[PDB]
Design an enzyme around this catalytic site. Structure first.
Site, PDB file in Angstrom:
ATOM      1  CG  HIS A 199      14.906  13.097   2.890  1.00  0.00           C
ATOM      2  ND1 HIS A 199      14.281  12.058   3.000  1.00  0.00           N
ATOM      3  CD2 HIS A 199      15.420  13.372   1.862  1.00  0.00           C
ATOM      4  CE1 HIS A 199      14.422  11.259   1.781  1.00  0.00           C
ATOM      5  NE2 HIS A 199      15.444  12.192   0.920  1.00  0.00           N
ATOM      6  CG  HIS A 238      19.810  12.045  -1.817  1.00  0.00           C
ATOM      7  ND1 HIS A 238      19.936  12.004  -0.432  1.00  0.00           N
ATOM      8  CD2 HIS A 238      18.507  12.058  -2.175  1.00  0.00           C
ATOM      9  CE1 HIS A 238      18.555  11.769  -0.006  1.00  0.00           C
ATOM     10  NE2 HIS A 238      17.670  11.943  -1.164  1.00  0.00           N
ATOM     11  CG  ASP A 239      16.611  14.982  -1.884  1.00  0.00           C
ATOM     12  OD1 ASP A 239      16.478  14.867  -3.185  1.00  0.00           O
ATOM     13  OD2 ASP A 239      16.110  14.133  -1.095  1.00  0.00           O
ATOM     14  CG  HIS A 246      12.696  16.666  -0.490  1.00  0.00           C
ATOM     15  ND1 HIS A 246      11.331  16.557  -1.118  1.00  0.00           N
ATOM     16  CD2 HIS A 246      12.990  15.344  -0.560  1.00  0.00           C
ATOM     17  CE1 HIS A 246      11.059  15.440  -1.600  1.00  0.00           C
ATOM     18  NE2 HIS A 246      12.091  14.641  -1.289  1.00  0.00           N
ATOM     19  CG  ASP A 266      15.563   9.055  -1.920  1.00  0.00           C
ATOM     20  OD1 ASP A 266      15.349   9.896  -0.963  1.00  0.00           O
ATOM     21  OD2 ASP A 266      15.358   9.555  -3.107  1.00  0.00           O
TER      22      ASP A 266
HETATM   23  C1  19F Z   1       1.717   6.248  -7.212  1.00  0.00           C
HETATM   24  O1  19F Z   1       2.891   7.036  -7.219  1.00  0.00           O
HETATM   25  C2  19F Z   1       3.010   7.690  -6.191  1.00  0.00           C
HETATM   26  C3  19F Z   1       2.356   7.710  -4.770  1.00  0.00           C
HETATM   27  C4  19F Z   1       2.688   8.280  -3.840  1.00  0.00           C
HETATM   28  C5  19F Z   1       3.873   8.955  -3.701  1.00  0.00           C
HETATM   29  C6  19F Z   1       4.121   9.745  -2.554  1.00  0.00           C
HETATM   30  C7  19F Z   1       5.264   9.311  -1.981  1.00  0.00           C
HETATM   31  N1  19F Z   1       6.449   9.755  -2.107  1.00  0.00           N
HETATM   32  N2  19F Z   1       7.208   9.214  -1.493  1.00  0.00           N
HETATM   33  C8  19F Z   1       8.681   9.541  -1.840  1.00  0.00           C
HETATM   34  C9  19F Z   1       9.263  10.316  -2.872  1.00  0.00           C
HETATM   35  C10 19F Z   1       8.837  10.008  -4.381  1.00  0.00           C
HETATM   36  C11 19F Z   1      10.306   8.568  -4.471  1.00  0.00           C
HETATM   37  C12 19F Z   1      10.209   8.201  -6.223  1.00  0.00           C
HETATM   38  C13 19F Z   1      11.069   7.080  -6.329  1.00  0.00           C
HETATM   39  C14 19F Z   1      12.340   7.268  -6.912  1.00  0.00           C
HETATM   40  C15 19F Z   1      13.239   6.586  -7.365  1.00  0.00           C
HETATM   41  C16 19F Z   1      12.827   5.328  -6.948  1.00  0.00           C
HETATM   42  C17 19F Z   1      11.654   4.942  -6.267  1.00  0.00           C
HETATM   43  C18 19F Z   1      10.949   5.972  -5.857  1.00  0.00           C
HETATM   44  C19 19F Z   1       8.632  11.782  -2.874  1.00  0.00           C
HETATM   45  C20 19F Z   1       8.842  12.305  -1.526  1.00  0.00           C
HETATM   46  O2  19F Z   1       9.252  12.514  -3.657  1.00  0.00           O
HETATM   47  N3  19F Z   1       9.430   8.937  -0.993  1.00  0.00           N
HETATM   48  C21 19F Z   1       8.453   8.139  -0.234  1.00  0.00           C
HETATM   49  C22 19F Z   1       9.051   7.393   1.188  1.00  0.00           C
HETATM   50  C23 19F Z   1       7.388   8.414  -0.489  1.00  0.00           C
HETATM   51  C24 19F Z   1       6.125   8.047  -0.167  1.00  0.00           C
HETATM   52  O3  19F Z   1       5.986   7.311   0.730  1.00  0.00           O
HETATM   53  N4  19F Z   1       5.089   8.493  -0.689  1.00  0.00           N
HETATM   54  C25 19F Z   1       4.614   9.357  -4.988  1.00  0.00           C
HETATM   55  C26 19F Z   1       4.213   8.537  -5.987  1.00  0.00           C
HETATM   56  O4  19F Z   1       4.721   8.385  -7.072  1.00  0.00           O
HETATM   57  C27 19F Z   1       5.982   9.360  -7.186  1.00  0.00           C
HETATM   58 MG    MG Z   2      15.636  13.723  -4.596  1.00  0.00          MG
HETATM   59 ZN    ZN Z   3      15.511  12.054  -1.235  1.00  0.00          ZN
END
Ligand code: 19F
Ligand code: MG
Ligand code: ZN
Ligand code: 19F
Ligand code: MG
Ligand code: ZN
Lengths: 338, 325
Positions: free
Chosen positions: A82, A118-119, A78, A230
């Site tokens: 990003h 946004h972050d 973050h 995102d």
């Molecule tokens: C089974 O549930 C998960 C499994 C793995 C993760 C880790 C993960 N988080 N992640 C994220 C976010 C969470 C995104 C949550 C989200 C929010 C709003 C709409 C969709 C997803 C982390 C960095 O905080 N972005 C990406 C591209 C990923 C990613 O590839 N992997 C997070 C998980 O849940 C949050």
């Molecule tokens: Mg965020």
């Molecule tokens: Zn983000």
């Protein structure tokens, strides 16, 4: 000082000059050196005609971009790169999907600005950690939920309220209020709990068909688009998604280490002793990312390749998962690791 | 040097012979043979015994596991059985002496490959011995004969014709018994003898007990602490995977346990302990209630492999914080 001077007086470089593939879904914005990203932001803004359309003051816009970038810390995932890569995907949706047939110009502008902000000031921990660690941010916002997202929004507002940085300060009262309300709604939509709450409404919208005259459809579409930006790391090639995974788990595992030190049991995905990365990523792809891009595909037929790539990456985790089992000996010919 | 001057714990089942510096092993062999009173009772010539012992040590090569330190560890366990189990109630003195000497010689000139590989690669050893089977074990015996017939190394040269012949035949049976195929062939017979009761005046029981003891010495690394059985697994698999690489180069496909791309060490070791090692020490326990602790160490070591199996799955990140592997 000097960074501002060059942005202001050198002129806005043409978007095509950044890379020949800059406007393609196959471009990976993390390839751009961090030092070139502030100019790339201005180049994108210009290419979308926002600078001219909203008569944005150039000294003010230069100061705003630098202040937004300076407003990110450097945890593994973050960080400013990003935010930059999320903003870039927003630009890609604009260039490739014809968003203007769906959204108002001001909504598109607000989406892009929200992507940059946004972050802001993310400390590499999530909402539950704020609450458990009794942080100042939780003292402020825990009773409303979306603790970090409210902080990100508050930070964006504080930047605008900094002398020299209010890129909207000439807007009419109504337009200014519209912009700030949009930024609030879009930034808060990056919380997963929010997304899960509106998922069925998003499904219903794609099923009945987008209605440009429906105010609620506009709001729902902005949320879906923000979430697709995102998560847009997942729409890139295998090598990108692999590196991103590393960064995300490094950050998650650091949090789990802090939770253990406070006497708490971290979630499995934050616990470096229990997390099994391939299953966690397959689950994220299948249950969260794939449905978002399937929705996007339902609304924009040209978004098909995006869903196809996320599906392909999900498949690749399956193919590589066997390598997480140690067969034979480790490279040092020793079983020291017990 | 009396055995008690080597280490206060030398004659204990807790002692790890691999702790002893390799330079001191030849002297420990003499001390063990002195402690069993074999030199005095069969009137062995001491310089002849010294020359024999050094020739045997020199006749081992240096693969990761099948080297002199293995043969020394195996023969030390034989001594441990002598001291702790009171073998002289069950076996003639000469069978004990034969067993110990066989332990020293049992893997002579091992090349770090199994019998199948000798035959597959058409080595000279396969040309010589494949028709009769137990290729490597026949070579080990023929190396030991070769040593006895080197000038100044015949420790049996004063023995009566009867005793000399008895020693030759015992060494042959015992060394041939180190083959896993042989062990599985006689296993039902071993169980039978343990069920009906060992008979000190039945010559066949003596033969069977000698075979069982030999295999008990060959596997004895598994009767030690976890650290020892972990280190020895490292050595065994380095040796196996080296043969598997050679087989792949010859265009063949190795057995799974020698294929570094396929072998899963915890499952293989658990399987070895459960289905091969434990039944042997159980038998030993049935015949000698004093050997109970040996079986117990083996079963405990088996449980530890299953408590550490999970570590063979990479959870979290690697140490370098990267997925570059
Ligand atoms: C089974 O549930 C998960 C499994 C793995 C993760 C880790 C993960 N988080 N992640 C994220 C976010 C969470 C995104 C949550 C989200 C929010 C709003 C709409 C969709 C997803 C982390 C960095 O905080 N972005 C990406 C591209 C990923 C990613 O590839 N992997 C997070 C998980 O849940 C949050
Ligand atoms: Mg965020
Ligand atoms: Zn983000
Ligand atoms: C499921 O079958 C096996 C699984 C694993 C092995 C590897 C292995 N072999 N091994 C060995 C010998 C084989 C012993 C075979 C044997 C012979 C006579 C009586 C019992 C067993 C290797 C080095 O050649 N000694 C030890 C202490 C081990 C050991 O701990 N593991 C060998 C296996 O079968 C031979
Ligand atoms: Mg052998
Ligand atoms: Zn052996």
């Amino acid at each position: 000082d000097d960074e501002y001077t060059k942005l202001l007086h050198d002129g806005i470089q043409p978007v095509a000059a950044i890379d020949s593939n800059f406007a393609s879904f196959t471009y990976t914005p993390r390839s751009l050196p961090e030092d070139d990203t502030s100019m790339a932001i201005l180049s994108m803004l210009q290419d979308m005609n926002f600078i001219n359309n909203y008569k944005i003051d150039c000294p003010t816009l230069a100061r705003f971009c630098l202040m937004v970038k300076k407003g990110y810390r450097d945890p593994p995932y973050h960080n400013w790169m990003h935010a930059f890569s999320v903003s870039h995907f927003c630009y890609l949706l604009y260039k490739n999907l014809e968003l203007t047939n769906y959204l108002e110009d001001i909504e598109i502008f607000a989406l892009f600005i929200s992507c940059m902000c946004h972050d802001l000031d993310h400390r590499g921990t999530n909402n539950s950690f704020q609450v458990a660690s009794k942080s100042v941010l939780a003292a402020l916002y825990s009773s409303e939920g979306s603790v970090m997202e409210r902080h990100h929004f508050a930070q964006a507002i504080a930047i605008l309220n900094t002398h020299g940085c209010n890129i909207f300060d000439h807007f009419s009262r109504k337009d200014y209020q519209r912009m700030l309300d949009l930024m609030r709604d879009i930034i808060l939509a990056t919380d997963l709990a929010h997304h899960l709450r509106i998922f069925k409404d998003l499904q219903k919208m794609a099923e009945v068909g987008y209605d440009r005259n429906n105010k609620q459809h506009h709001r729902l579409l902005l949320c879906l688009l923000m979430t697709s930006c995102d998560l847009s790391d997942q729409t890139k090639g295998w090598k990108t998604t692999r590196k991103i995974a590393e960064l995300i788990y490094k950050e998650f595992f650091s949090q789990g280490d802090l939770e253990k030190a406070m006497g708490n049991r971290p979630m499995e995905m934050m616990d470096r002793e229990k997390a099994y990365i391939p299953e966690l990523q397959i689950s994220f792809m299948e249950h969260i990312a794939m449905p978002i891009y399937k929705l996007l595909q339902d609304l924009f037929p040209k978004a098909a390749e995006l869903y196809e790539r996320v599906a392909s990456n999900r498949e690749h985790w399956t193919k590589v998962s066997h390598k997480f089992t140690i067969r034979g000996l480790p490279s040092n010919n020793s079983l020291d690791f017990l």
